[PDB]
Scaffold this motif. Structure first.
Motif, mmCIF file in Angstrom:
data_model
loop_
_atom_site.group_PDB
_atom_site.id
_atom_site.type_symbol
_atom_site.label_atom_id
_atom_site.label_comp_id
_atom_site.label_asym_id
_atom_site.label_seq_id
_atom_site.Cartn_x
_atom_site.Cartn_y
_atom_site.Cartn_z
ATOM 1 N N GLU A 109 0.807 -1.223 0.000
ATOM 2 C CA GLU A 109 0.000 0.000 0.000
ATOM 3 C C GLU A 109 0.831 1.260 0.000
ATOM 4 O O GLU A 109 0.404 2.275 -0.560
ATOM 5 C CB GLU A 109 -0.936 0.022 1.191
ATOM 6 N N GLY A 285 -6.556 7.246 -0.020
ATOM 7 C CA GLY A 285 -6.699 6.838 1.353
ATOM 8 C C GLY A 285 -6.899 5.362 1.576
ATOM 9 O O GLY A 285 -6.573 4.559 0.731
ATOM 10 N N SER A 286 -7.453 5.007 2.734
ATOM 11 C CA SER A 286 -7.524 3.639 3.215
ATOM 12 C C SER A 286 -8.264 3.658 4.550
ATOM 13 O O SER A 286 -7.998 4.500 5.403
ATOM 14 C CB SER A 286 -6.104 3.137 3.456
ATOM 15 N N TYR B 20 -7.364 13.748 2.767
ATOM 16 C CA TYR B 20 -8.712 13.739 3.390
ATOM 17 C C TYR B 20 -9.139 15.174 3.753
ATOM 18 O O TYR B 20 -8.274 16.000 4.050
ATOM 19 C CB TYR B 20 -8.708 12.838 4.628
ATOM 20 N N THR B 106 -6.152 -5.612 4.532
ATOM 21 C CA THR B 106 -7.058 -4.534 4.183
ATOM 22 C C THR B 106 -8.021 -5.005 3.113
ATOM 23 O O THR B 106 -7.796 -6.037 2.491
ATOM 24 C CB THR B 106 -6.277 -3.318 3.661
ATOM 25 N N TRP B 143 -13.737 -0.353 -4.307
ATOM 26 C CA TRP B 143 -13.122 -1.448 -3.583
ATOM 27 C C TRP B 143 -11.684 -1.217 -3.197
ATOM 28 O O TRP B 143 -10.984 -2.184 -2.946
ATOM 29 C CB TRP B 143 -13.294 -2.773 -4.350
ATOM 30 N N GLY B 144 -11.285 0.057 -3.091
ATOM 31 C CA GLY B 144 -9.957 0.444 -2.672
ATOM 32 C C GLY B 144 -9.265 1.461 -3.563
ATOM 33 O O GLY B 144 -9.833 1.922 -4.520
ATOM 34 N N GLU B 195 -20.976 -5.491 -5.611
ATOM 35 C CA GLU B 195 -21.432 -5.312 -4.243
ATOM 36 C C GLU B 195 -22.942 -5.517 -4.222
ATOM 37 O O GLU B 195 -23.639 -4.972 -5.071
ATOM 38 C CB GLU B 195 -21.144 -3.894 -3.760
ATOM 39 N N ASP B 228 -18.407 -8.673 -3.337
ATOM 40 C CA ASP B 228 -17.720 -7.847 -2.357
ATOM 41 C C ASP B 228 -18.651 -7.491 -1.197
ATOM 42 O O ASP B 228 -19.500 -6.628 -1.328
ATOM 43 C CB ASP B 228 -17.174 -6.583 -3.014
HETATM 44 C C1 LIG Z 1 -17.320 -2.807 -0.228
HETATM 45 C C2 LIG Z 1 -15.853 -2.413 -0.092
HETATM 46 N N1 LIG Z 1 -14.869 -3.152 -0.660
HETATM 47 C C3 LIG Z 1 -13.464 -2.734 -0.509
HETATM 48 C C4 LIG Z 1 -13.106 -1.637 0.205
HETATM 49 C C5 LIG Z 1 -11.598 -1.196 0.360
HETATM 50 O O1 LIG Z 1 -11.156 -1.663 1.597
HETATM 51 P P1 LIG Z 1 -9.904 -0.973 2.470
HETATM 52 O O2 LIG Z 1 -10.017 0.582 2.585
HETATM 53 O O3 LIG Z 1 -10.052 -1.666 3.826
HETATM 54 O O4 LIG Z 1 -8.588 -1.269 1.813
HETATM 55 C C6 LIG Z 1 -14.206 -0.789 0.872
HETATM 56 C C7 LIG Z 1 -13.752 0.439 1.650
HETATM 57 N N2 LIG Z 1 -14.855 1.357 2.063
HETATM 58 C C8 LIG Z 1 -14.271 2.732 2.417
HETATM 59 C C9 LIG Z 1 -12.822 3.125 2.516
HETATM 60 C C10 LIG Z 1 -12.753 4.623 2.292
HETATM 61 C C11 LIG Z 1 -11.455 5.483 2.263
HETATM 62 O O5 LIG Z 1 -11.125 6.170 3.251
HETATM 63 O O6 LIG Z 1 -10.722 5.505 1.242
HETATM 64 C C12 LIG Z 1 -14.047 4.969 1.589
HETATM 65 C C13 LIG Z 1 -15.060 4.004 2.202
HETATM 66 C C14 LIG Z 1 -16.585 3.978 1.911
HETATM 67 O O7 LIG Z 1 -17.186 2.947 2.052
HETATM 68 C C15 LIG Z 1 -15.503 -1.156 0.722
HETATM 69 O O8 LIG Z 1 -16.555 -0.398 1.327
#
Ligand SMILES: Cc1[nH+]cc(COP(=O)(O)O)c(C[NH2+][C@H]2C[C@@H](C(=O)[O-])C[C@H]2C=O)c1[O-]
Ligand SMILES: Cc1[nH+]cc(COP(=O)(O)O)c(C[NH2+][C@H]2C[C@@H](C(=O)[O-])CC2C=O)c1[O-]
Lengths: 404, 404
Positions: A109, A285-286, B20, B106, B143-144, B195, B228
């Protein structure tokens, strides 16, 4: 819960994915430099989870930091601020002398983040036409298992079968300044990402003056120098960063593994404002990146490294380890290489032995280490190890090598 | 260490990256459904860290699991086996009824892993010519923030500036079975990743029978269905998985966020042997993936969900929340949608108000929620919330919406 070692293997075989082939040893406890298995056997750890436990397993000060913060707050997401993050950011930035840090979780990451920065800066600051920006890597590199990471890998095991590869990634030989010079002739190159010592490739150390050359060429052709110090950084090679050995300041440094002490997935991307601020709000972000729990562990984990002078320890003990390993016979051990406590040996693969077999016998003599290509065994103990302990381990190595 | 809220903002502004723009609120403590700021103010949490704290912040049983394991062992890397992992694997697999699980950290990493599987299976099992394999996604997906993740994004903020994109990602409209049917005509398509409810896009729920359609079309054209459920899974929508609402069994399910309860980054990829075993030893992994500490938290975190019947709670309270939100005036709140405790409202942006302004005023009345596009406010409290508490929060919502 089956308590025996064979039951641990076969249970993981049935219900878990077969994406690893680990050294058959089922561990149950860890403290400092020592690991214990479920039948109560005791092992020196000479892998340090690829440098994640520089501070030794379950270092008390890092444990307490975790224990203290869990009772308070662990995750708000970055939709809001938490009280801890900015404190961590002020420390890490002032420690390494960069304007800003971008917090992430895993090592991949941090890499992904650096590429995004490299590219963004390429388009917005350098003026490269959109989606022609390139990143150069070095052959043998390793920086994670994402589709992007494996797209810059010269290892067939990593990329074979994993489908179309990310464009814009050029690959040149490691430890080769003429190759870098050739490549940076293309004005569309944005960054060059490189490790000061290549870990996963088998502790490959570049010639003295390589990093100075990389810094000088990058600066000359207006290309960002990204130092991946996820494994070599934080004291292991015998300095804060391995690049410090040649007094070089990369544009972007990546930190990971030891940043937490093995207690939490924390990675960091350190750079100055002209690069970092190319990424506006909402554009990266993350979920877990910068969370209160990770930041607390990280502060503690960095404090241990400084206040126990682990770099200085690593440097001195490194010398001893290498000097002793070089006394082994040239017919069996063809090379010894390393900086600080990131060393390795290459064994001559023959009809009576290989690196895997050696590592199996090391395990039987109370030392844990893993081969990384079939001839290369890595020797990376935690940095809290002392001179006598190291000299016990060396005797375990000698004994095992000479028994074949 | 500056203790005040404005000092927390300005310190993060100086030393931290500007990726952010959080809701101005500096949190210091969290417990169950409640968050406290550094001036001691108290807030209902209606984001649950995008579903990471389904079990409420610092749930004691999950805390104790963490506290117990830290004193023992936290990370060996997967160069060796640990005693915990296989226990976790036996539980999670038997819970969701899939042969095997692949542990990651993650959510993005779980996604990346699923694509790698989709592709590998495509080449090795389906017989697609190497590097022509395709993955279909749905518009609005999230999804990221890896280069791959953003390569399948229809959101300009995510991909613009981030350089050449991963090939082999086709994108079709969400909630559109004719589009899916069209796309799966190409024999080189390996998977469709979708999703059950799109979180980041603004809690977009598909029509009843969409997932049955997706399952039927995927099966018909020999394409893998990847669900997902990183955000919708684990009780939030009112079931173990949101897909359960239509009794559909995806080939690959992704879990994350709540899998830990906010105490550790843990994600999982669940599938059967014919798909999972396409990945041989050495070809995929992650330093912290499957570590003893994360697995212990995960077991505990999954136990809370089952034994506190949080799905059943979520379903019933969801109905109440939505029914109340629909009583708000159509002139201000143009839409209410959700399943279980994953709901949202759309606010009509005008010269006297928008979603950001609303969320600021909600904060001033002791409720925390963030807008996800500028008109959409998300209402996702922890699942341990009880009926009276929920009815206090609703009064806070009504009050705030009607005050403009
Ligand atoms: C269904 C699904 N599949 C994969 C991931 C990625 O997962 P991850 O961040 O843990 O790597 C997410 C992450 N959801 C976030 C993270 C965020 C940020 O701050 O960027 C925005 C926010 C809104 O929902 C997800 O909802
Ligand atoms: C220099 C550098 N840059 C980035 C990363 C990504 O780190 P991460 O795993 O956290 O994404 C790493 C991690 N190196 C690993 C991971 C490991 C496994 O078991 O998968 C095998 C291995 C050998 O070196 C790294 O050494």
């Amino acid at each position: 819960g089956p308590p025996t070692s064979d039951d641990i293997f076969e249970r993981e075989y049935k219900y878990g994915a077969h994406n690893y082939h680990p050294l058959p040893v089922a561990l149950e406890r860890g403290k400092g430099i020592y690991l214990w298995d479920v039948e109560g056997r005791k092992y020196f750890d000479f892998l340090s989870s690829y440098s994640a436990v520089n501070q030794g397993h379950c270092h008390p000060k890092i444990v307490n930091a975790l224990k203290s913060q869990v009772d308070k707050l662990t995750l708000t997401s970055r939709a809001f601020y938490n009280n801890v993050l900015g404190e961590y950011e002020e420390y890490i930035t002032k420690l390494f002398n960069y304007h800003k840090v971008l917090p992430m979780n895993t090592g991949v990451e941090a890499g992904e983040t650096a590429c995004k920065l490299a590219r963004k800066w390429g388009y917005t600051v350098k003026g490269i036409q959109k989606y022609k920006a390139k990143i150069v890597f070095a052959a043998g590199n390793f920086w994670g298992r994402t589709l992007s990471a494996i797209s810059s890998s010269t290892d067939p095991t990593s990329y074979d079968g994993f489908g179309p590869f990310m464009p814009g990634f050029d690959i040149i030989p490691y430890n080769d300044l003429p190759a870098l010079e050739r490549a940076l002739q293309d004005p569309n190159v944005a960054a060059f990402m490189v490790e000061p010592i290549q870990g996963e490739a088998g502790v490959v150390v570049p010639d003295p003056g390589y990093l100075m050359g990389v810094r000088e060429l990058c600066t000359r052709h207006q290309v960002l120098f990204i130092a991946d110090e996820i494994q070599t950084g934080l004291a292991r090679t015998g300095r804060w960063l391995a690049v410090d050995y040649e007094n070089v300041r990369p544009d972007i440094v990546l930190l990971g593994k030891a940043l937490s002490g093995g207690l939490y997935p924390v990675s960091a991307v350190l750079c100055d404002d002209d690069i970092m601020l190319t990424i506006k709000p909402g554009e990266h972000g993350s979920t877990y990146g910068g969370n209160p729990l990770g930041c607390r562990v990280a502060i503690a984990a960095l404090e241990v490294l400084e206040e126990e002078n682990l770099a200085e320890n690593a440097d001195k003990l490194g010398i001893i380890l290498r000097n002793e390993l070089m006394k082994l016979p040239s017919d069996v051990v063809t090379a010894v290489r390393g900086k600080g406590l990131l060393n390795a040996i290459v064994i001559k693969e023959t009809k009576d032995w290989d690196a895997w077999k050696v590592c199996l016998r090391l395990r039987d003599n109370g030392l844990l280490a893993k081969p990384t290509h079939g001839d290369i065994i890595r020797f990376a103990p935690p940095l809290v190890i002392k001179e006598d302990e190291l000299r016990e381990s060396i005797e375990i190595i000698n004994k095992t090598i000479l028994s074949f």
